[PDB]
Structure formats: structure tokens, C-alpha cells
Amino acid sequence: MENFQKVEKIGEGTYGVVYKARNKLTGEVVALKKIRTEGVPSTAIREISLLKELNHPNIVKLLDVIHTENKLYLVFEFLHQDLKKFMDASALTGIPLPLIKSYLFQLLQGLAFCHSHRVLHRDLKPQNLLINTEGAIKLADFGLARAFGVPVRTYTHEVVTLWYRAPEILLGCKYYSTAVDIWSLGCIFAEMVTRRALFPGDSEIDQLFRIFRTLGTPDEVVWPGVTSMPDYKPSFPKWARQDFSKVVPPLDEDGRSLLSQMLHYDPNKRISAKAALAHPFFQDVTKPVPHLRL
Numbered sequence: 627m628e629n630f631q632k633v634e635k636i637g638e639g640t641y642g643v644v645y646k647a648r649n650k651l652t653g654e655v656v657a658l659k660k661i662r663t664e665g666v667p668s669t670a671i672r673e674i675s676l677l678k679e680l681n682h683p684n685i686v687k688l689l690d691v692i693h694t695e696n697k698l699y700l701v702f703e704f705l706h707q708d709l710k711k712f713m714d715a716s717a718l719t720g721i722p723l724p725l726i727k728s729y730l731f732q733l734l735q736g737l738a739f740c741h742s743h744r745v746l747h748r749d750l751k752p753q754n755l756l757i758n759t760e761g762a763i764k765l766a767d768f769g770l771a772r773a774f775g776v777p778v779r780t781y782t783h784e785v786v787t788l789w790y791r792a793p794e795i796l797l798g799c800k801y802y803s804t805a806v807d808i809w810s811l812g813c814i815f816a817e818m819v820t821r822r823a824l825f826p827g828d829s830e831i832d833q834l835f836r837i838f839r840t841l842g843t844p845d846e847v848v849w850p851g852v853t854s855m856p857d858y859k860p861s862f863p864k865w866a867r868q869d870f871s872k873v874v875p876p877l878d879e880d881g882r883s884l885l886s887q888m889l890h891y892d893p894n895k896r897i898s899a900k901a902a903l904a905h906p907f908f909q910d911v912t913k914p915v916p917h918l919r920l
């Protein structure tokens with residue numbers, strides 16, 4: 627690199643390969659993401675550039691947008707671990723409730739900030755939630771979905787995870803709202819509590835039906851306009867809704883109440899990040915130190 631020295635490969639993001647790199651001049655350690663095809667839209671670079679101003683303690687800082695050699699690299703602040711790996715490492719005993727609550731609270735603050743600035747994530751998942759030794763958790767990749775349009779695939783035939791997709795997206799809605807992020811975060815909250823993905827679909831229809839089997843097949847009563855959605859089919863099976871007490875045991879009523887509001891079918895009824903922060907579930911929130919092995 628002209629100013630970077632690759633330390634190692636962090637992985638292969640939905641946009642391209644990601645490396646942990648050191649700025650040879652500043653000595654700064656960062657995450658360098660090479661963006662995937664043949665042209666590089668000028669509209670995309672302007673949009674991404676705007677995100678460099680989106681700074682919040684719970685949002686992974688976009689340090690630079692490098693457009694050279696007709697190639698696009700995104701330089702992000704570096705964090706040592708993602709929530710997916712932390713959840714796997716905490717599988718035996720589970721993440722303690724105080725830490726789950728702290729993380730959810732911080733993620734909601736991050737979403738509230740992004741949403742107030744009209745920036746949506748659209749693809750929240752445990753792998754894009756990064757944590758450090760101080761007890762902080764940050765959202766990574768906000769705004770990239772809109773700026774880079776349709777995701778499709780990473781760049782090396784890697785299957786996209788649908789587990790956190792809101793139902794309006796699965797039903798073919800063309801216009802995303804802030805509510806899609808609240809849905810994803812609700813799914814993540816449930817997974818941290820139970821230690822199992824809430825809706826682990828292996829196809830778009832399996833994803834939709836797993837949601838329906840748990841929350842009940844939506845109808846015009848709970849979701850006005852659902853039967854007119856692009857991919858809605860009158861032939862969808864009609865499943866009865868299950869009780870939250872069975873879905874995320876042994877979470878308490880404050881937690882179940884909040885989760886239920888984050889999982890409302892109607893995006894318009896789904897709780898906002900701002901309103902969620904005021905939920906009684908957070909009355910006793912604190913900021914614990916996680917047991918992180920690096």
C-alpha cells in the first residue's frame with residue numbers, strides 16, 4: 627500500500643476483502659476495506675464521503691474514503707472483536723444480562739443518532755457490531771447499503787444471511803424505513819438472550835415463514851396494507867402467534883415488552899430507537915466490563 631502495511635486479513639465483507647492495516651506514517655492501526663466492479667459510481671463516492679461526518683461513540687468511525695487508481699478503499703477505526711464471535715465465545719454461560727442490556731442500550735443510542743441524521747443501516751447483524759475491552763459496542767457499516775445500492779454478494783460467492791431481515795423487506799417493499807434497523811436489533815437482542823438465532827432462515831421464503839410461525843401470519847388487522855405488498859401471496863399458510871414467554875425465555879417482562887415493540891409487523895408501529903431508550907427495561911442499565919480474550 628502507498629501508506630499502509632497489511633497486518634492480516636480480517637475477513638471478506640459483503641463489499642470486499644478487509645485487512646487490519648497500519649498507517650506507516652501515523653502508526654495508526656485501522657480496518658481497510660477494499661470495495662468491489664468496473665466503473666465506481668461518482669454518486670456512491672459522494673454519498674460515502676458524507677458518512678465521514680457521521681461521528682458518534684457507538685458508530686465505527688469512517689476515517690477515510692480513498693479513491694485512487696479507480697479503486698475504492700474505506701478506512702475504518704479498528705476494534706478487536708465482533709459480537710458474533712463474542713456470542714460464540716459466551717455460548718456456554720451466556721452473556722450476562724447487565725452486559726446484554728448495556729450493549730442494547732448503546733446500540734439504540736447509535737441507531738437514534740444515525741436515524742436522526744437520516745442514515746439507515748439496512749443490514750445489521752452480529753458480525754457488524756464491534757466491541758472493545760472498555761465495554762463499548764459500535765455499529766459498523768451504517769449507510770453503505772444505500773450508498774452502494776443493492777448488496778447481492780460479497781465478491782467471492784458468499785451466501786447472504788437473511789436472519790435479521792425485517793418482514794417488509796422480505797415481502798418486497800422497495801422503500802426502507804428506520805424500522806428495518808429496529809427489527810434487526812430486536813432479532814439480535816433475542817439471540818443474545820437465548821443463545822440461538824431467533825429466525826435462522828435458509829432462504830427468503832424459509833425466513834419469512836419462520837417469522838410467521840413465531841409471530842403469526844400477518845393480516846390487515848395487525849399490519850394494514852400487508853396483503854398489498856409486492857411479494858405477499860394469499861396462499862401463505864396462516865399460523866397462530868406464539869407467546870413471547872416461549873420465544874425468549876427466561877427474559878423478564880420488561881425485556882419481553884421491549885422486544886415485542888421492536889418486532890411489531892407494521893414498520894409504523896415498531897418502536898423507534900429514541901422511544902426504546904426510554905423503555906422501563908433500561909431503568910437499571912449500567913456499563914459492565916466484558917471478559918474479552920484477544
Ligand SMILES: NCCCNc1cc(NCc2cccnc2)c(C(N)=O)cc1[N+](=O)[O-]
Binds near residue numbers: 637646656704708754
Ligand atoms: N466476517 C465478518 C467479520 C467482521 N469484520 C470486521 C471486523 C472488524 N473488527 C473486529 C475483528 C477484528 C479482527 C478479527 N476479527 C474481528 C472490523 C473493524 N472495523 O475493526 C471491520 C470488519 N469488517 O470490515 O467487516
